[PDB]
Ligand binder design. Sequence first.
Ligand SMILES: Nc1c(O)cccc1C(=O)O
Ligand SMILES: Nc1c(O)cccc1C(=O)O
Lengths: 278, 279
Amino acid sequence: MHNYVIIDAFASVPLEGNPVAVFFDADDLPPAQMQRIAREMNLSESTFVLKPRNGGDALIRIFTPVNELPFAGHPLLGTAIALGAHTDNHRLYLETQMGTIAFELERQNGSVIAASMDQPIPTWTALGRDAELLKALGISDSTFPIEIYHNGPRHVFVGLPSIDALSALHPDHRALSNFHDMAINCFAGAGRRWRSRMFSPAYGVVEDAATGSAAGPLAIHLARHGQIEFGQPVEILQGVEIGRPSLMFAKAEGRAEQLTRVEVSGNGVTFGRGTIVL
Amino acid sequence: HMHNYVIIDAFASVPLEGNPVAVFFDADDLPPAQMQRIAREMNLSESTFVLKPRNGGDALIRIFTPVNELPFAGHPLLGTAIALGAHTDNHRLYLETQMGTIAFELERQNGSVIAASMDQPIPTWTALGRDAELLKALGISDSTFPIEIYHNGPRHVFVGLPSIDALSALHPDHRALSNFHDMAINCFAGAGRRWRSRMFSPAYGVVEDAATGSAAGPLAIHLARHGQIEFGQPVEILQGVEIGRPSLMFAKAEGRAEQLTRVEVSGNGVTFGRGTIVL
Ligand SMILES: Nc1c(O)cccc1C(=O)O
Ligand SMILES: Nc1c(O)cccc1C(=O)O
């Protein structure tokens, strides 16, 4: 039997943010069973905590309902918050398929409130499928060039001219399914405050509440396109329209040609705790 | 305030098959607005909330999809009956709903409730009359049977496919189906005692559902009305194969079209997990 907790990542109260089911003591489970368990939970991701193999504190495997990912932001944030209960550490190193991810935990009286991670530095290129993607999204143009970023998963960014226009999107889920191994992140905002919506048939979700591995790339994207400075922290509010408001904090330090750090942080809270029969 | 829950895989006899439902106990203190938000948190096809009875039943059950309340549903109530069956030695359980009281017969084996049978509300039905729209959303040109919509609380449309291969090949347009409000689209194929189904319902917050128990009774009626089976003939309906959640629903509809006397749906169910939440 395995214990799990349900963490609402990128939230300061239960029922906000983005849930992740974190399964402990998972070294006995084959990956095909981890995948089926993720399918059972039907959350954007479930994670599995394994003994470390390369000097971290734990090795974490991350599954959507349909596929394994090599890195993901909300699932790891929630995993770090949940594991932080195990010990008194304030620095935590979590192994993934993209390498070891460093976390700093915000604790009060030993109790974990939030965490900050140093993400993989993404690479990027032009999508080159603009007409097709804009048609699928139901819009004419992006406000900025349409580029795809890779940090394990892949994230495409499409800019909208207002928050109302963002909220008005009704994408064609089936047309989006022709965009394999990527998530589509639509953004709008100004200055230090941005809104997002994410859609990804490829990762098993019509609309995700908080796509943490997109937050770092968005900060880069906004700085590369002159809307914020490199190093300027931004707030990215995702999931509003679906009733799952999620507050992601991001900062990308360096310059376009040489990034030094991509920090994403958030609060997270426990929604529940239990045990599965396998 | 805190609440215990179980996860039942309905219409399955092993965990990770069937259709999960989260059943929350002692839920009277949750306003419906919070029950709705908890159903979205769980993100299963439904969560249920067990409330004290008001009309002579054992409990009153409220049923939520990730996006709306339903007055009746089959897999969620099967799972709720199995979960509550753990708490009693009784053979029968009476679950009050917005559609009235639903009677369950519980099947036990070596001290565990392993299955249950329900008598569903007798549905009404009519032709849908939106065939070109619906067939275009599904990506097909016609139905093997008249396209009819049944109501037993929720609503279920049935579209017939000429082979299981044709059913498995469907890739419906989720957005186009969202114009079909307050209903589920159930596509079926098979013969005799053995049928396959797939269900799609943006209205009820699901791209594709693994086991639509409130569609099982209506499908048995549909098949008898259209000459494919006899009234009273038990059928096996296998749903959810293509999404990796095979679910076996057993259904029988007794009487004749002008007067059905019983619409029975049964299945196995098993506990996947259990826990407690912070509100
Ligand atoms: N939540 C995510 C998802 O649904 C797909 C891909 C990535 C994430 C994430 O949190 O990074
Ligand atoms: N599972 C169901 C769903 O997803 C929508 C409506 C009804 C049901 C059901 O099990 O009856």
